[PDB]
Every structure is written in C-alpha cells, then in structure tokens.
Design a protein around this ligand. Structure first.
Ligand SMILES: Nc1ncnc2c1ncn2[C@@H]1O[C@H](COP(=O)(O)OP(=O)(O)O)[C@@H](O)[C@H]1O
Ligand SMILES: Nc1ncnc2c1ncn2[C@@H]1O[C@H](COP(=O)(O)OP(=O)(O)O)[C@@H](O)[C@H]1O
Ligand SMILES: Nc1ncnc2c1ncn2[C@@H]1O[C@H](COP(=O)(O)OP(=O)(O)O)[C@@H](O)[C@H]1O
Ligand SMILES: Nc1ncnc2c1ncn2[C@@H]1O[C@H](COP(=O)(O)OP(=O)(O)O)[C@@H](O)[C@H]1O
Lengths: 408, 408, 408, 408
C-alpha cells in the first residue's frame, strides 16, 4: 500500500528510534518490496516471497520498536510471539498456528476499530436527522425542490445549532425503538444503530484476512532460544521441534481461523535473537533459507540514552511534561538534568543487570515519583528538573547496588 | 487430469528445477499413473494404488521444489508436513489426521479462490447491468426483438463506454440493497453481490473432497527423523509410533473433515529424508511396502548454483531484475558476476554449514542490500552487477567465518 | 447375510491369498457362524457370541489380507487398528472407543457410497424426464391411457436417442433451480437432486449401525506388542492397560458414535501377532477367553512368492500388464522371468530384513521403472520380461546389500 | 422391581452359574433390598442405601457372570468398568464420571430397543392400515355402526389375508410420503413411519435416568489393582487417587449426562478382586465402609468344569449342538467326552496359566474346529463326540506345553 521509498521509511522510523540505521534500512527494504511486488506481472507475483529478516542484538536496544513502528507505519497487522512459548507444547502448549490466528484476531480488532472512524461522522450526521425529525416532524409529503427540504434550514437549523451543546431534552423515537428515552440518550442509542447499519459486516471480516495475507507482520522474539545448545539433548529436540513447527508458516501454508482460511505465503517475518549462546547458523537449514536478511543492532551508549530521552516524538520526557501539564504544572528538563538521568541509567545497567533502554523508564519514574504525587497541589508552578534535582533524587539509590536490584 | 506424458512432465519440471532428473522421472511416473488408472475397468481401479515415493537427499537440493511444482503442474491439492511434528503427541500434539484435514482446508482455500477467477467476469458483465439500469431505467416491459434490449446500445452503449473509468456518481440500487450510495461502492458492492449467486455449496465443498481423494499430494518431510536410531529406546517407540500413526493414511483409510468424509486410498505420498543416521530399511515393514519408489537426489555443485541463479523461470536473479525495474532501475548480471555469486554461496556452505541452494538466496540478498535501498534514488540508471561488484560486496563477509554464521 | 459354506468361503479367499489354508478355515468358520446364529431361537441368539480369532505369524505373510478379503466378501465394515496406538493414551491418546467410532464412520462412508449405486440408474432415469419435459413440454393435462403418455415415445424418443451423446445444448429448468443452465449442466445438477430425493437419510445412517453391530470386523494388529515383557515394568502396566481398555469391546459393551449408540457384542475380532517376544498365554486371562480361536500362518517360501506374483486375481503382475496396456504396450512375463523375480525378493529378505511378500512389490517396481517411464514412447510393442531382462535389472542391486536397504 | 425372594433369585441364577452359592446369596440379598426399601416410609427411604458388595476370587470363576445375570434378571442398567482404566488419568484419561454416563447411554440403548418390542405390533396393526387404505380407499366418510368399518372385513379381510406374503405391488401413500413406491418398501417405510408416533422423548429419556438411579448396577473389576502395594509410592497415590475419585460415586453424588442429571445414591456397586497382592483392608477407609458385603468365590474344579459344560441354559455345549443343527448336523456329546473336555481344560490351566472356565471355550472350540468347517458337507448325519474323538483331537495339543500357550 504505502508508496514510501525505503529512504522515506527510514526517515519516518527515525522519528521513534535512535540509531540502528542498518536495522532500519533492512526493515524498510522489506516494506518497499511489498509494493515492488504488486508492480510485477501475474507469474512473478507468486514467485517473489517476503524477504524475512533476523535481527541480532542485545536486549532492549530497539528491535521490537523498529518492528512495531514499521507495521504501524504501513497500518499492518502486527503480532509479537515469544518463540519459547511453544517449547512446552511437547507436553501440551499453544499450537504454532495460533500465531496466525491471533494475528487475525487483532487484525480484526483493528479493521473493526478503524471502521468506527469513518462511521463516526456520517454515523452521527444522519443520526441527527433522527432526533430532528421529532423536533420538526417533516411535512406530509416533502416537496421535491432539493431546497424545499432545506427550508427550515431555518426552524430546522435552530434545533441543529441548539443541538450543538444544549440538549439533554427528553424525547421519543423509533426493532427500531418506539420508546420514550431522553435526547441525550436518543442521541446515544442513535450513534450505534445508524453507525452499524452503515457497516458492511461481511466485507469487514473478509478484510482482516486481506490484511493478514497482504501486510501481516509476525515478530518472533528470541528465536535464538530455540536453537540447539551443548547443554543437553532432550530439550534440543523440542527446541528444534518448534523450528519445524514454525517452518510451514514462513515457507507458505494455510491456517484455519475462526474468521476464515488465511494463507501465510506473504506475511513478513521478523525474527529476533541475542545469539550469545547459539549462532544464526544453528537455526535449521530450512529456516535459515527463509531468513535471507541478517542485520545487527548495536548496544546503546549514554549518548544514545540522552537522545532517546528527549528526541523521539512523544518521547518519555515529552510525555511527562504532557502529563504534568494536565495538572497545571510546567515541567522543564535542563540539558544536564537529562545528561545525568541517562548517566544514572547506564550506571545501573553496568553496575547490575543490563536491560538496555528499558532502564530509562524506571530511572525516570523513580525520579518523578515526588512531583507526580504533588503535581495537583503544585498547580500553576514552574518546576525545573536540573542536574541538582536529579542527583538529589537518584544518586543514593544508584550507588546502593542491592537497593538498585529492587527499586530501579 | 493432465494428459501429459512423463517426458512432458519432466520437461515442464525442468523449467523450475535444475538437475535432479531421476527424482523428476520418479515423480513424473507417479502423475502419469493417475491418468493410467482412470483408463482402466472397475475392479482394477480399486486395486491399483498410488506408487508412493521416497526421496533421498541432502537439504535444499530440490526435494520439496520438485514435489511442489509437480502438485502445481497438476492443479492438485498439496500439503507439506514435517514428520517430527507428531513425535511429541505421545505427550500431546497434532493427530496425524490433521494432514488430510489441512490438505482439505487448502484443497478448499483453493477451489474457492479458483471460483473467483471463473466468476470475475460474471459480476463485470451480466452483473454490471446493475448500475446501467439505475442510469437508464429500462423500458416499462422491454418489447422483444433480441436486439431491442440491444437497440440502445447507443444511449446504452454510451453509459457502458463512459463507464471505462468515470464514476463516483452516487445513485442507488437493490436483502438486495436499496440503500443510497456511490459507484466506487455501488459498483464494487456489485462485484461480490452478483457472484455468490453462481457459486453454490454442495458442489464447491463437495469437489474439494473429490480433489484431495483423487489428486491429493502429501509431502512428508524428514521421514528419516522418525526411524529407529541406536542411542535410546523411549524416543524410538515414539518415532515408530508416528510411523504406525501414519500407516492408516498410506495404506487406505477414512478421515473426518469439517467439509466431509475424505478417503486416502489414492492420495499420492512423497516422503523425504537425508538418511545419514538411518536407512530406508529402518522404516517399519508396512511403510517400506507403501513406499515402493526410491530415488536419490545429488548434492548441488557450483555449476548447478550458477544455473539455479538464472535458468529457472522467475529465478531469484530474474525476480531481482524485475523488482528493481519497479524503481525504474535497470539491473544487469554479467556471466562472471553470477559465477562469483554461486562461488561465494558454495564457499560459505563448505566453510560453515551446508544448506543447499538456500544459501544462494541469502548471499544474493546481501549482495543487493545497497541497491535495494537506493533504488528509488537511482531511477533511470543502468546498474551492472559484475564480478567486481560481487567481490567488493561479498568477499569480506565470506572470508570471515564467524561473521558468516550471522550475516550469511 | 452370506449363505456360503465355510468351504465356499475358503475357495473365494483362495482367489486372493496363497496358502495359509488353516487361517482361511479359521476365518471362514467365523463368518459361517454369524449365519448359523440367526438360524437359532430368541434365547440362543444372545448367548452365542462371536468366536474371535488370534492369528499368529511372521510379518507380511497374509494375515491382514485374509481379514480384508473376508470382510470384503461379506460386504462387512472393516477396520484395522494398531494396538500400540493406545500405549501412549496413558499420557494422552486416542481412546479405545475410537475403534468402534471409526468402524462406524467407514461403515457409513460405505453404506452411503453403496447408495449411489442403486441411485445412479433411477437417479438418472427420472433425471431425463426433467431435461425432456422442456424439450417437449408435456400436454396440458396428459390423457390417462398409460400409452397416450408414451406417445412421443416418437417426438419424445427422438430427444432421448439424441440425448445418448449429442447434448451439451443449453436450456432451463427448475429451491428447484428456475435458472437457465446448459443441458450438459442441467443434466449434471439433475443427477444430484433426483438422486438425493431418492435417498432415505434416516435409514441410511441407521443402517451403518446395523452393519457394525451385525457384521463388524475389527482387526487389532500387533496385539502381541501389548503383552507383558521382561524388559521393564512401567510400560507393562500401560501395555496391559490397553488390554483392559480393549476388554469391554470384545466382552460386549456400548459405545457412543456421532451417528448413534453402537453395541459391540457381535462384532467379530481378529487379533494379530508375531509372538516372538511374548506368547498368547501372556494376554490377560479375560482376553484369552475372548480369543477362543488360534491359528498359525506359515512363513512364505519362494514357491509361494512365484505364485503370489501371478496367481491371485488382479495379482500385481496382472496389474502391471493392465497398466502398460493403457499405454498400448503388451507386457509379458516368462515363467523364468517370474521365477527369478521371486528369487530376488527372497534374497533381499534373507540377505537383509525379511518383510514377507511385501518385498515383491518393491522388487517388481524397481524392475519395471524402466518400462513404466518409456511405456508411452513404446506404444504398439510387444515387450517381454524374461530371465535375462530381470537379471539385468535386479542382480547388481540385489547383490549390493547396503544399496538394498535403500533401493529395494 | 421384581418381587422375587432371595431364594428365588439364587434359584434363577443357578440356571446360568455353577457353584458360587455364597456370591449368589450376597448378590440376591442386594436385589431383594431394593424391593425392601420401596416398602418403607419417607425418611427411611433416603437413609437406607445399597449394600454394596465386594466379590473376592480368582479369574473366570463367575464373578462377572453372576453380576451380569443379576442385572439381566432385574432388567436393570448394567455397566462393567475396569478399575485401572483410570490409574492413567493422572497423565490424562477417562474421568470416573464416564461410568455413570455409560451406565446411562446403555440405560438408554436399552429403553430404546425395548420400545421397539412394545411398538412392533402398532406398525403392524393400527398402522398396516396404510397399505389397505390405498388398496381399497375407504368410503367417502365411513358411516358408523362400530362394525361398518368392519363390514368389509370381506373385501377388506381379503386384502389382509392375502397380505400374508403377497406383495411387491407398487402403489403410493402419504412430510407424510406421497412419493410413489412398492410394498417391500411402502410396507416397511410404514414399519418405522408409524411407531415414532407412540414413542415420545421426555419420558423415554426421562426414564433412563429413572432406571440408572433406581436399578443401576456398576461392576468395578480389578478393584484390588488400585490398592496400595509395597513396591513404590508414586503409582500408589495414583491408585489411591482412583479410589478417591470413585468415592463420590458410591458415597452419593450427582453426575452430568447428556440425557439429564443422574443421582448415584442408590446405584448398586459390585466391586471385584483377586487379592493375592493386596487385601480388602488396603482399600481406603471410606471405600471399605461403602463396601459392606464381602463374599469369596472358590476356584473351579474339574467337576465344576463338567457341570459348566452342559448344565447352564444355553451352555457352550448346547449352543454348539444348536449351531451344527443349522447345518442339518446332529451333534452328540457322551458323558465321557465331556469328562475329557473338562479334563483337558484343567490340564492346560494347571500346566500353563490358570484362566478359569474361560479355558473351556478355547478347548471346546479347538476340539470342534474340524466339524465346524465340514458341517455343510455332512448334512443329515449323526456325529458323536465321544471320549475317543476328544482324545484324538486334544491330546497332542495339551501334551505340548509351548504349543498350548499358543493354540489353547
Ligand atoms: N533505539 C531505540 N530508540 C528509541 N527507544 C528505544 C530504543 N531501544 C530501546 N528503546 C526503548 O526501550 C524499550 C525496549 O524494547 P524494544 O525497543 O522492543 O527492544 P528489544 O526488542 O530489543 O527489547 C522500548 O519500549 C523503547 O521505547
Ligand atoms: N535443483 C534445484 N533447482 C532449483 N532450485 C533449487 C534446487 N534445489 C534447491 N533449490 C532452491 O532451494 C530451496 C530449497 O528447498 P527445496 O528445493 O524444497 O529442497 P529441500 O526439500 O531439500 O529443502 C527452494 O526454494 C529452491 O528454490
Ligand atoms: N499369502 C499371501 N497371498 C497373497 N498375497 C500376500 C500373501 N501374504 C502377503 N501378501 C501381500 O503382502 C502384503 C502384506 O500384508 P498382509 O498381507 O496384510 O500381511 P501381514 O498382515 O502379515 O503384514 C499384502 O498387501 C498382500 O498383497
Ligand atoms: N461358576 C460358573 N458358572 C458358569 N459359567 C462360569 C462360571 N465361572 C466362569 N464361567 C464362564 O467363564 C467366563 C469367565 O467370566 P466370569 O464368569 O465373568 O468371571 P470373572 O469375573 O472372574 O472373569 C464367563 O463367560 C462364564 O460363562
């Protein structure tokens, strides 16, 4: 669908993810190819399959984010499954077909929500006619003048303009209704009925299928945790089993959904792994063939952290300012206050367990717990978060390691 | 169905698979036999059963491809199951019947889509009459001169000629419809509207059964993974269990599908293995019997790699050219460039893990990563991928083994 | 149902199975008894139960064949279950009731198919009247003369005789139809409608029950693999469990089928075993009581092989000739060519793993792979398969043992 | 239900079981108590519960037979479950509730078949009037002399007398029917047609519940196999688990059947064991309590064997005679022949494994194998099975032990 050049995609991604340009390019080329395919002929459209990608990189450095934003960019159905979820199917577990079912169910909860959008205007623009037709019961046989109807568009208008706020005035209208419920309510009930009658139920569910088959995006997390390891053998078979199980989905097959028969031949797969224990070459051969694209994502630096704190759109820092404004408080971070927040996050990560960027959210939240509570009682003020404030609210905690494993 | 001779079958198969002539003939004898059977009497038709085949060879050399093109060439329902998918059902898992079920759900998701092809002219011919009737509401009871309702085909033929792209003119027509609408919709609402009339149920779903029973092709990958190996015993009975479970399917039985009652007695089975650990004679007696045909496939050579790169119809190289064309970019591969692409693929396979022709897809794909991204900013150019280009892009990757286990 | 003397049964069996006369007599007496019972009085009909048989013999020597032919002789529902299938039910597995369910489902796919037989004549003899009544629309009020109707049996006949081949002529007829579909098609659609309206749906499914309860034949393969062994203990319980589980089915009980409540009191059971590890006396006592008949089947000799190759009806040799004729090739086996084919089969069996008669199919197929392919391009010829041809196509393979474990 | 005294019950039971008088009385006291209860007041009817019995004895001596004839003699629903059938549900398997379900599905497959007996005269009396009405279409509104529609019973009584075998005369009658047909069908189509009218649902299915609740008899074989043995502990809790699971059933509870809601509080339970390993006191306390009656059965003696051979009603010997008669063959057993048949049966049991009276069925059956096959070619003869015959046929088999473990 999208007509964005790979370069235009990366640009749009740059709005939510810092660095990891290579991984961006990789994900952009994949999208661009879905367009490139439709430009081909009958034959070549069956042959060319998705160029599935395998992202290799440490925890919390942007792999899922790149995927989510990529799908959210192409308004595509997106599902994220943790590969290891199926390790236990050997004894009893979710079937691997479920991935495509759940892909569909959210691809439905999606096409259905984005239906309430177009049917939220005309859904209540023809919903007024209802309430109005009982405030100015139309003439006995309107007079075809295409303007003789828009006549009250005098009397009529008056009720429309007075129905722009001052309503709540009890009435009665019409399985239609025929009841005598408030206008604030008639209006409400109406939102539904008129909206629904405007929604083609069959093409609705048939469209979710169209989505999954055409723009589906499955992100298999930690696929490296289902590769063979020199620790034992019993598990390896099941681990490997999950690979064989996943095989048809990425090779091309048909799964049964309670909304219809979906084909996976064109879903795009983004596999993810840390690959510290196993190596991509440890995936079964059939799978390595289906993951032609390989890209590494680098670990984040403190400079990366600083930027992630303020640069993205709706970055967590911006979000805080937004939320505090709701309370009437003007929050402001100084360059050093931010340099220092990032600094703390890197410290707990090096000091304890490295959880990537995720660490900024916990540090940031611990730092604002004070303001967050007081906010309301602090309305109309200009609170500034600088190096001092930061250092005064994190240092002690950050320095105390055992406490860090609990509180940050 | 097809009246093709084996020789013509192999020929047709040569358009997609390089080498593996013996497997080609094996699989071709199989198809021609289905024909040979229908040319027989009552008794002999029950007696004669498919000559199931056992393909023996290393990964990615054309086993599945051969079987997939065979299926495609006989418009036959095809399913590919991984044998170990059931080694776990001793603890829970998919029952082997699922195979015939899926081969049915896809033997349906097939007859259905191929009913949209046959009925794609009905809604845009003897059904586009919907808009034209609300455009020029036919005479009060047409007269009748077998050219009288073709007379207009002046006033009429004008609305049809003008209906070659000019729409978005809202009208209305007719649970038929009635509802007022446009044409980018009254027309499309008609696309499906008039179509579900010709396609019925007890024939569409009745025929799927007919297909599976008569032309079904099951490909059982890794059959060798469920033979007995001399390392333990507990897992062996599980393995042999899958063999016993599969027994009813290839010996002749009845399975229950939510579309009817399928009879497997004439499904063609192509089993597949590598047989490095086990040997076909490790299969249970009853299975070896039902697997009369044995054929080996050779490993691929660098020459086969060169040939696979360009000879097949819609070869990866050809597809690539096509895709870049979408960007207004003329890509070109010189004989030496291809010679080196194959060379690299062979190197990595020999130095790391051998994954057959699969390796070509990842090598080729990495080689092009750059052009694929810049394609949009190169429109109107003639990029040549020669030996130089190939070397500058793949040398360093292939040279570094650990790197290859990740990036190639 | 059948009125054949035990001796007449064995005779009819002799048409498909070589030797194993004792096992024949055993299976014949069992059938004959079902008749003998119905000749008894009210009381004695409940008392006399089936005389279940336990066939003891090496692999592939005719045990299943005798059973299949016995059932196919009495047009009885026949099911073959592998006893070990239920060993895993301990952890999760097919219930043993399934045996009687599946018995029923195929006893249905049976009574339903044999319904299309009687309703294939009158199904299309009253289906013509349909197509004809629109080619010679009957008089306005036919004139009751029982011959005044068979009048056109002038005009009328002409269309009938011209409807013996030259049809395909578009028409229209009548949820009836009322559509305007081709006669080649009207005719087709008609085959269904008229046929169906001719089938009593209730007595249909109620008859399958009647079949299973009255002529059911369950062949439990490898029951010896669920007897106790001096290898362990844990399994023995489950192994033995399967015996307790099977117990009610052969002792007399009621199972629930999705087509109705079926009673097993009169199904005939034929258990099968090799009994190399266990002995029949190792079955639990309750079971040994229900298997009053014991018969051994001898291993096959080369003389047995030679005869099995040409003597049965629709023997594999005959089948080949049949299939090759389809191609216009006259195939002929000389007495020595056959003596030699059998000789090879015995050799691979002694040399490698002995799979009984099954070995003839693989040898025979390997031997004809050449002709089978060329057939078409060999039309109109008289190909003879003698000792030379045979020896030239098998010797090398047979002599190479390791190759035999793969290719033969 | 039955008003039989214990003494009369035992008497009636003596017609099928040799010896085991104590078990007879135990089981007889049980039946008479059900009667005794209904002769009581409100309170005492809830309080008084079945006196469940625990039968103790070696295989095949009459435990089940006794319990089966008891059930049969009180036209009571009967089910026989093998206790270990649930020792595996700790990993999966049938829940103990299935017992009451099955005892219901058979308490149905019983009331249904016994509704075809009561209604087998209705379709061939007040329903055979269907054919006679199309034979002599009754007067335009019968007059009315309570002998006027009996007047014909001349023209009428002629069609009824002639309808004593003379049919195949096609007519038609009346979703009633209408469709033209024959009589080997209009008549039979009437058999069921008029019958489903008298039998209703909410009484037939309502009564099954009534039966089970009031007269249900559960026979739990091998109860001793789920007691605690001193070899391990893991399997013991599983065993004791089945005991706890069975507890609700014999203590009083409600189970859910797809036919209604069954109450077990008055189901009679007959548990069964051998008790060589465990002793009844190994059963859990709550179960011993609910198993108030304890009775032992003795092992059978050669004399019991002779007696079992001929005394019971429809004894195997009698059945045999009957079956051979079907062939026009008069079979005869002399006192010494029988003495030797029993002797042989005892020998094998003593020399190999003891399987009680069961052994008689297999010995007797082998002894007759020859006559059974040649029966048809011996019509009109008097074959005597004397001591000589017996010896010539069984001596060699019994003498060879290994042979007996297979053939006897
Ligand atoms: N490169 C990045 N740019 C912006 N935010 C990032 C980046 N890396 C991680 N994050 C933040 O950290 C969280 C970590 O999850 P995610 O980004 O999915 O990566 P991973 O899949 O490797 O754990 C995300 O919610 C995201 O907001
Ligand atoms: N002989 C061949 N000719 C053409 N393509 C081949 C050949 N062998 C392998 N391939 C390519 O490699 C992939 C490997 O899969 P496949 O051919 O099914 O073999 P395998 O069943 O051994 O995995 C396929 O996508 C196919 O396009
Ligand atoms: N005695 C025989 N006569 C004819 N064909 C036989 C005989 N024994 C085996 N066969 C052939 O070999 C195959 C072996 O299977 P089967 O006959 O079921 O015996 P088993 O159950 O012992 O394996 C059958 O399909 C049959 O065609
Ligand atoms: N005392 C007996 N009287 C008559 N028949 C008996 C007797 N004991 C055993 N049998 C026969 O042997 C078989 C053994 O089963 P059963 O009598 O139920 O005992 P068990 O419950 O110990 O197995 C039955 O078919 C029955 O006909």
């Amino acid at each position: 669908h999208s007509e964005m050049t790979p370069r235009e995609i990366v640009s749009e991604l740059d709005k939510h993810i810092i660095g990891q340009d290579n991984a961006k390019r990789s994900v952009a080329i994949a999208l661009r190819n879905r367009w490139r395919r439709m430009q081909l002929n009958e034959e070549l459209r069956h042959e060319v399959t998705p160029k599935n990608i395998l992202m290799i990189g440490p925890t919390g450095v942007g792999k899922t984010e790149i995927a989510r934003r990529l799908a959210k960019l192409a308004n595509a159905p997106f599902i994220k499954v943790e590969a290891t979820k199926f390790t236990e199917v050997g004894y009893v577990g979710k079937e691997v077909d479920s991935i495509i079912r759940d892909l569909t169910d959210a691809a439905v909860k999606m096409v259905r929500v984005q239906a309430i959008e177009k049917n939220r205007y005309r859904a209540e623009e023809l919903a007024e006619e209802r309430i109005l037709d009982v405030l100015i019961p139309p003439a006995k046989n309107n007079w075809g003048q295409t303007e003789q109807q828009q006549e009250p568009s005098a009397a009529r208008q008056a009720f429309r303009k007075k129905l722009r706020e001052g309503q709540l005035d009890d009435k009665e209208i019409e399985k239609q209704k025929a009841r005598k419920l408030k206008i604030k309510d008639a209006m409400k009930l109406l939102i539904e009925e008129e909206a629904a009658k405007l929604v083609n139920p069959e093409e609705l569910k048939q469209d979710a299928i169209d989505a999954v088959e055409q723009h589906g995006i499955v992100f298999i997390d930690e696929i490296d945790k289902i590769c063979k390891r020199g620790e034992s053998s019993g598990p390896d078979v099941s681990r490997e089993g999950v690979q064989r199980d996943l095989l048809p989905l990425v090779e091309g097959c048909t799964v049964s959904t309670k909304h219809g028969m979906v084909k996976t031949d064109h879903i795009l797969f983004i596999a993810s792994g840390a690959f510290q224990i196993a190596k991509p070459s440890d995936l079964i051969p059939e799978l390595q063939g289906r993951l032609p694209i390989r890209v590494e994502l680098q670990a984040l630096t403190t400079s990366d952290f600083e930027r992630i704190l303020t640069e993205p759109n709706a970055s967590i820092t911006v979000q805080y300012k937004a939320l505090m404004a709701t309370e009437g408080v003007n929050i402001e971070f100084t360059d050093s206050g931010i340099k220092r927040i990032a600094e703390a996050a890197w410290q707990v990560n090096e000091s304890t367990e490295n959880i990537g960027a995720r660490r900024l959210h916990t540090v940031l939240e611990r730092l604002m717990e004070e303001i967050s509570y007081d906010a309301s009682d602090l309305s109309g003020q200009n609170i500034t978060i600088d190096a001092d404030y930061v250092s005064k609210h994190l240092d002690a905690l950050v320095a105390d390691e055992d406490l860090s494993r609990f509180i940050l």
